[PDB]
Amino acid sequence: SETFVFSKDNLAGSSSGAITFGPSLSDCPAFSNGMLKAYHEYKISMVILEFVSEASSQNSGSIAYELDPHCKLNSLSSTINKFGITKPGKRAFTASYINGTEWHDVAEDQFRILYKGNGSSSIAGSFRITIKCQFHNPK
Amino acid sequence: SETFVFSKDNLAGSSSGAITFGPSLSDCPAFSNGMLKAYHEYKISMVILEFVSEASSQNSGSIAYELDPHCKLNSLSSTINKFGITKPGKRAFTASYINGTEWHDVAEDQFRILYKGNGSSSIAGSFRITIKCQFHNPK
Amino acid sequence: SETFVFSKDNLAGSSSGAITFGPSLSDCPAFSNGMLKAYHEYKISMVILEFVSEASSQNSGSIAYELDPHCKLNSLSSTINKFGITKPGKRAFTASYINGTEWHDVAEDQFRILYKGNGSSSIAGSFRITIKCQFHNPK
Amino acid sequence: GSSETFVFSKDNLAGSSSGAITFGPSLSDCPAFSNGMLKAYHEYKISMVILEFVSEASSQNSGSIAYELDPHCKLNSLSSTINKFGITKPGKRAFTASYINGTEWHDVAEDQFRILYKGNGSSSIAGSFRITIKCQFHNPK
Amino acid sequence: GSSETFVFSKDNLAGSSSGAITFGPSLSDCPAFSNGMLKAYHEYKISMVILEFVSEASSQNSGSIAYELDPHCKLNSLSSTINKFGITKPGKRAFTASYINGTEWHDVAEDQFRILYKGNGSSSIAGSFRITIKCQFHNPK
Amino acid sequence: SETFVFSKDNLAGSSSGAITFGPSLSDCPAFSNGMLKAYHEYKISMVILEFVSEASSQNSGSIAYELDPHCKLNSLSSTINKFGITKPGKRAFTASYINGTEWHDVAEDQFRILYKGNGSSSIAGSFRITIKCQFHNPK
Amino acid sequence: SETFVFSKDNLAGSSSGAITFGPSLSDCPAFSNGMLKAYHEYKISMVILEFVSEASSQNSGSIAYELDPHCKLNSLSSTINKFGITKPGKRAFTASYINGTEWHDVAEDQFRILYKGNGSSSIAGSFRITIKCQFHNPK
Amino acid sequence: GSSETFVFSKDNLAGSSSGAITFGPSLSDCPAFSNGMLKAYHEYKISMVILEFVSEASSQNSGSIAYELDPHCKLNSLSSTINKFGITKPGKRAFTASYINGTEWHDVAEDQFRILYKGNGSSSIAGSFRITIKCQFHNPK
Secondary structure, rough: EEHHHEOOOOOOOEEEEEEOOOOOOOOOHHHHHHHHEEEEEEEEEEEEEEOOOOOOOOOEEEEEEEEEOOOOOOOOOOOEEEEEOOOOEEEOOOOOOOOOOOEOOOOOOOEEEEEEEEOOOEOOOOOEEEEEEEEEEEE | OEEEEEEEEEEEEOOEEEEEEEEOOOOHHHHHHHHHEEEEEEEEEEEEEEOOOOOOOOOOOOEEEEEEOOOOOOOOOOOOOEEEOOOOOOEEOOOOOOOOOOOOOOOOOOOEEEEOOOOOOOOOEEEEEEEEEEEEEEE | OOOEEEEEEEEEEEOOEEEEEEOOOOOOOHHHHHHHHHEEEEEEEEEEEEEEEOOOOOOOEEEEEEEOOOOOOOOEEEEEEEEOOOOOOEEOOOOOOOOOOOOOEOOOEEEEEEEOOOOOOEEEEEEEEEEEEEEEOOO | EEEEEEEEEEEEEEHHHHHEEOOOOOOOOOOOOOOOOHOOOOEEEEEEEEEEOOOOOOOOOOEEEEEEEEEEOOOOOOOOOOOOEEEEOOOOEEOEEEEOOOOOOEEOOOOEEEEEEEOOOOOEEEEEEEEEEEEEEEEEE | OOEEEEEEEEEEEOOOOOOOEEEEEOOOOHHHHHOOOOHOOEEEEEEEEEEEEEOOOOHHHOEEEEEEEEEEOOOOOOOOOOOOOEOOOOOEEEEEHHHHHHOOOOOOOOOOEEEEEEOOOOEEEEEEEEEEEEEEEEEOO | OOOEEEEEEEEEEOHHHHHHHHOOOOOOOHHHHHHHOOOOEEEEEEEEEEOOOOOOOOOOEEEEEEEOOOOOOOOOOOOOOOOEEEOOEEEEEOOOOOOOOOOOOOOOOOOOEEEEOOOOOEEEEEEEEEEEEEEEEEE | OOOEEEEEEEEEEOOOOEEEEEEEEEEEOOHHHHHHHEEEEEEEEEEEEEEEEOOOOOOOOEEEEEOOOOEEEOOOOOOOOOOOOOOOOEEEEOOOOOOOOEEOOOOOEEEEEEEEEEEEOOOOEEEEEEEEEEEEOOO | EEEEEEEEEEEEEOOOOOOEEEEEEOOOOOOHHHHHHHOEEEEEEEEEEEEEOOOOOOOOOOEEEEEEEEEOOOOOOOOOOOOEEEEEOOOEEEOOOOHHHOOOOEEHHHHHEEEEEEEEEOOOEEEEEEEEEEEEEEEEO
C-alpha cells in the first residue's frame, strides 16, 4: 500500500491541460517509468489534490478541475468544481469516485483530471497530487 | 439513487428490437437526456422487466428476451427465456447479471435487452421497465 | 431523492439577475429539459448556495442575494444577505425557507434567488448551486 | 370535519374513447359529490382514491386503457402511457394522499386533481371505471 | 338503503316575514340535500323532523311565529294559527313519520311536505329556524 | 413567533364587512405595517375570535361570521355560526381551518372573516382578535 | 420574542455616525414606524453586529464601534473595539451589556452604537444588525 | 420594608366621562397612599394591581369603558381601545409586576404608572372603579 507525492508547478492562469494517472504520467518520473514498468496490476485508491496559491492577489480567475474516470474527455466540459486562484484548496477523491475498485493493466490509464484556468498569464499556483495506490502480481 | 420507471408500448407479436440501457435509451427522456447529462458515472443496480399482456386471449406466440450484458449482439440469438403474450410476466435482474458491479461513463452503454416475438402482427403487450439505479460524481 | 449541481459563472460585479428553480432554469440543461419534462411533481428540499471568489482583491463591492419563495419579485429589494466579493461564502436553505414542504407541478416555478451586485464590471466570482430535490408520480 | 366515502362509476368506456375525470366541483359523474357536499362545506380534500377497472369485455378483444394522474389539472389529454390496465382483466389501483395532492385543504371552487384515460383498443365496449373516493370536509356553510 | 341526518338553518326570520320551506327537491336552504343525495337516489323519505326556534331576539320584542305542517304541498301561505312559538323563548317540536307523510317512498321529483311560517310581531329580527331532518334513501342511481 | 392582539370596535348591529388577515389588515398597524414589511413568509397558526357585548340587554339580533379560508367571497353568504349580541362569545380556529399549514408571501392574503349582523343600528359590541402567528426568512 | 434584521450599507471608510435603537431607528422602517408605534414596552435582549467587508484590500483603516447604553454620547470617544475594514467581523451583545434587563417606553431610546471610521472615502463595507427583542403590554 | 394593601374606589364614572388615574404621589382618590405612606418612605413599588369594575348601571344602558395601562406616564388621554369592560357586567383584571413597571424601586417624587379610562356610552352612571394596589415600601424617612 505505497504512496506517491508529486507536484505540477508553474500552472499558468489560462493553461488548460490534463493529468492522466497511469503510463502517461510523465510528470512523475518515479511512477510512469518506475513501479509501472515492473508490475502488472495497480489501482489508485485515493487521490488528494491540493491547490497551493502562489498567485498574487491581483490575479482574477479560477482553475476548474474535472475528474474523468475513463479518460474519455480531451478537454474540460463542466466548470463546477473550481479553486479560486487567490486561496488554497484541498480535495479528496476516494475509491468510488476515480474508478478505483478494480485492478488495471499498467498499459492502460485509470483516470484523468482535466484542469482549465481562465485567469491571466501570470503564475497562478501549484498542484500537489498525493496518490495512495497499491500494486499486485509482481513482475 | 432513484427508481426510474418507463415503458415501451405497441410491441407487435413479431416486433424485433433492442433496448440499450445507457445514453441511447431514447425511450425515457428522464434517463438519457436527464441524469446522464448531469453525472459522469452510473450503475443500474436492479432491473425489473414486466410484460403487461394487451393481446387477445385468442392469439398465439410468445416474446423472447435475451439479456446481453456487454452489447455484443445486435439481434436476438437465444430464446430460452420468454413471456407468453397471453399471460402477464415479471422478471428480476440483480446487479451481477447486468454488469452493475462497476461504474461506467455516460458515453458507454452498460447492457441491453434484445426482444423479439414470434407471434402474428397483432398487438402483443407492453414492456414496463423499472431500473433502480444510482449516480456519482456530478458534472 | 436525487441531487443536482450546477454553476452560474462569470458573475459580473454589477450584474443583477434572477435564478428561478423550475421549468425556467435554463442554466441547467439537465433539470429544465430533463427530469421536469418527464415528471409531474417535484420539490426542492434543500438548496446549498456557495459563492466562490474568483475576483481580484482589488474589487470593492458585494453580491446581495434575496430568497423569494413565491417568485413575486422581479428585482432585489432588501440588501441584507450578502457575500463579500473578495471572500468565499456558503449558505444552506432547508425545506421551510424555500417553500419546499409540498409538491408542485413541473409547469410552475417553486422559488427564486435574486442576486444583485454593486461592484465593478470585472469578474466577481461564480455561484455553485446544489439542489437536493425529489420527484414523484412518474410520467 | 366530516369523513365520507363516495363510490361511483363511469360506464361504457369504449376501447377507443378517451376523456378526463376531474375530481371536485366538476365531477359530473357523481352528482352526490360535485353538487352535493361541496355546496355544504368550504374545504374538502380527497384523502384516498381506489380506481378499479371492471372488465365487461370478452377475451377476444385486444387492447388496454392507459390512465394518468394529473395532480394540478394542467393536462387536457393523455401524454405518456406508462400505467395501464388490460381490457380483458379486472384491475385495481390505490392512490394515497401525496399522489393526488390531498395533503392540503382546497377551496370548493378549485379542481383538486384529475385522471386522464385513453384507450388503444377497438371501438367496442371495454369495461367500467369504478372510482371510490374517501374524502374529508371542513368548515360547514 | 342509506340513513342520513341533515341539519340546516334558515336565518334572519324577521317577526313579520312569512314564507314556506318545502322539503325535497326544492329545499334551497340546504343544498346538501335538495341538490345532493336526491341526485344519487331514486327514492327518499323524511322519517323524522326536529324543528327548533333559536330565540336571538331580546325580551322587549313581543310576538310569535305560527308554523303549520302541510303534508301534501297544496298550501301556499299560512291559513290557521294554532301551533306557534314565542319569539323570546326557544322552542322545540318533533314531527314523526305519519305527520309528514313519511310512510311512503316518494320519487325525487316530488315535494314530500312543507312547513309554512308566518310572523305576527314587529319587523326586527326574531330568531332562527334550525331544522334537523332524519331521512332514508333507496335505489342508488 | 408572537401573539398579536387587536380589535375592531363600534361594530353596529347591522355592520357588514370583512377582516382580511394579511397585508390588508389595516386594523392593526403592528401587523400589516410592521412585521409584514420585515419578513417574507408568515403563517397564522391560531386565531382566537372573541366578541365582547357592549350592546344593551334590550336589543335583539346576532352577528354572524363566515371564516373564508381563501378569500373568494367578498360578502357574507352563510350564517351557520354566530354570536348573540347580548352574550359575550369566544371561538377558536386552529391551523387547519385557516390554511395555516403552508406559508405565504406578505403580498398575499391568507384568509378572511366576513362579519355581518342582522340587528338594529345600535352599538352591538367589539371584536377582539388574537392571532398567534409565526414568521420566517427575514427581509 | 420576535427578531429583526436590518442593514446599514455603503458605510464610507471615514463616515462617523450613530445607530440608535428605539423610536429614532429610521434605518429600519419595520421597527421605528411599525411595532413601536403600536406597543408600549420593548426590550432589546440581544444585538448581533456583523461587519461584512465589501472594501477592497487596498483600503487602509478600521471602523471603531462604541456601545453606549444610555445615549449620552453624540460622538465616539474610545477607539478600542474595532473591525478591520479588510476582514469580516462578528460581535454579540447580551442583555447586560446593552441595558436590556428592564422594559422601556417606546418614546425613549434604549441604547446606541456609535461607529467611526478612519479610512478612505471609498466603500468600506456593510453593517448587519440582528436585534432579538421582546414586546409587552399590547397597545 | 413594609408590605401594604390599599383598596380605594373612584366612583360616579359616567359612561362618557374620561380621565386618568396616576398611581403614586398624584393619587388624589386615595389620600391614604398619595399623601400617606409616600411621606414616610423614600422608595415604593406597586407590586400588584387588581382593577375591578362594579356595574351599578342597569341592563338598558349600552356601552363600554376602555382602560389602558401606561407604564411610563407619557400618555395624557386614551389612544387605543383594545381592553374594555362592559358597563352592564362586573369586570376584573389583574396587573402583575412587569406590566406596571413594578420591578424597580422608584423615588416618591415619580409617578410609577397610570391607568387611562375612556367611556363610549351615554352620559348616565355606568359604575365604579375599585382599585386594590398591593405595594412595598423601603428606607423609612
